Amino acid sequence: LWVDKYRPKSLNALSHNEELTNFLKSLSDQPRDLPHLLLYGPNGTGKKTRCMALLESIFGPGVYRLKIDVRQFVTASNRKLELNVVSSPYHLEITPSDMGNNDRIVIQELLKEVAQMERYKCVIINEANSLTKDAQAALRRTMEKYSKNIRLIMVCDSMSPIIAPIKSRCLLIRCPAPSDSEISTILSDVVTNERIQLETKDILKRIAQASNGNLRVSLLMLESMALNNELALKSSSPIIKPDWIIVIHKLTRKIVKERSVNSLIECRAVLYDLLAHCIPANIILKELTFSLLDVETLNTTNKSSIIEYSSVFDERLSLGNKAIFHLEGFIAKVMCCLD
């Protein structure tokens, strides 16, 4: 895929957010005094790419010789847990949120093992914002203890769930999403590399706008559009959206058009179809909310009610267990306010 083929493999290959690239270059100039890093920003903006580029600047190209292994841990009630650890001769990558609430013991055991086995080895923790508070406290303790041999590079989309004690011990780095011009430049480089015919450069601008600052989404959308149009994009080429987004937009049009109990049953069927195929409930709620707010026929009162119900049921989703229970309630509340 073009999103992976042309991913920057070094700090010099980065093309957007020049100030952040300069900052990362300065960090690699003093490898010994590398602070713990917490990287936050919108999804698909280049956080992981920049982590890997900094690691390559420090240790060399060997960071990309990645190999995957399964480490087995045991907890109090002999419950064998398996965590997938992507490792290199210089660093480790873990996603402790994959273990649920058992992330604390996994983090403790793995970090202690890495510290004992050791100038230092960098550990990249993905989705740090979804770590439990106990896991974050254990992470702070390991930062205090094994700072000599362990340097943490945490990546998250929102810094709010991160506890205050961690924030003080780490260097907060902000990654804004690239502007439309930078996304257009990246897509232009990709299409020139892949020899894709463009009627006009305005096609790239439309792809950038449709992606809403998500560089991964824009690259994948460009690849999908190119394949559909026989490697020749025209000014009339439609923007290709994912299947789940199309389903959610259809659901939004259905909700707006008719508001009844039978419509609610069919919306339940659609939501079951979406949830059964690995579409997260929060993603469904966000897309459904922001599709409803874009309907031109709705007035200000309807949109205000919709956003209020969205906030309420988003809190209920975060505090809940069964996803379909809350999405159906949100849709039922929305139907009442429109009618």
Partner 1 sequence: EKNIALKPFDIAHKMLDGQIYSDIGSRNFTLNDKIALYFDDFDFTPLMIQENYLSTRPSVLKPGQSHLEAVAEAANCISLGDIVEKKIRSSEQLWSLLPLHAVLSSVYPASKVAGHMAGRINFTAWLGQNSKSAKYYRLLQEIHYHTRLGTSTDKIGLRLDYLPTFRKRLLDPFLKQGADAISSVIEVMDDYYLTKEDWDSIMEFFVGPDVTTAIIKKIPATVKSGFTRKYNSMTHPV
Partner 2 sequence: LAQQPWVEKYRPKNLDEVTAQDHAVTVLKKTLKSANLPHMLFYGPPGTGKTSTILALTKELYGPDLMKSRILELNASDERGISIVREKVKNFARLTVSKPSKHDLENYPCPPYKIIILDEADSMTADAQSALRRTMETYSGVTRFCLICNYVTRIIDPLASRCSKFRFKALDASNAIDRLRFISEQENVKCDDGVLERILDISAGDLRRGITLLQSASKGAQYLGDGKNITSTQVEELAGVVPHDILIEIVEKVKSGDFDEIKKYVNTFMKSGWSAASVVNQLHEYYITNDNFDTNFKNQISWLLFTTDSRLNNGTNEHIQLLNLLVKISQL
Contact 114, 75 (CB under 8 A): no
Pick out residues in 185-214 that bind partner 1 (CB under 8 A).
none
In angstroms, the CA 66 to CA 23 distance is 25
- Token digits of residue 38: 């917490």
Stretch that binds ligand GDP, among 44-52, 67-75, 260-268, 295-303 (CB under 6 A): 44-52
25 interacts with ligand GDP by CB under 6 A: no
In angstroms, the CA 222 to CA 204 distance is 8
43 interacts with ligand GDP by CB under 6 A: yes
20 interacts with ligand GDP by CB under 6 A: no
Distances, alpha carbon 336 to alpha carbons 260, 284, 289, in Å: 9, 20, 15
Contact 215, 183 (CB under 8 A): yes
- Token digits of residue 76: 């109090």
Give the residue from 44, 146, 137, 131 showing the smallest Cα distance to 94.
131
Q: Is 329 annotated as a binding residue?
A: no
Can you tell me which of 10, 12, 22, 84 binds partner 1, judged by CB under 8 A?
84
Pick out residues in 201-260 that bind ligand GDP (CB under 6 A).
215-216
7 interacts with ligand GDP by CB under 6 A: yes
Q: Is 43 annotated as a binding residue?
A: yes
121-126 and 91-94 as β-strands: parallel, antiparallel, unpaired? parallel
Pick out residues in 94-123 that bind partner 2 (CB under 8 A).
104
Can you tell me which of 99, 143, 175, 251 binds partner 2, judged by CB under 8 A?
175
In angstroms, the CA 256 to CA 233 distance is 33
Tally Cβ neighbours within 10 Å of residue 102: 17
CB of 214 to ligand GDP, least distance (A): 8
Paired strand residues for 152: 123
Stretch that binds partner 2, among 88-96, 119-127, 132-140, 235-243 (CB under 8 A): 132-140
Residues near partner 2 (CB under 8 A) are 23, 26-27, 33, 35, 40-42, 45, 104, 133-134, 137-138, 141, 158-161, 165, 167-168, 171-172, 174-177, 212-213, 282, 285-286, 289, 293, 300, 303-304, 307-308, 310-311, 314-315, 317-319
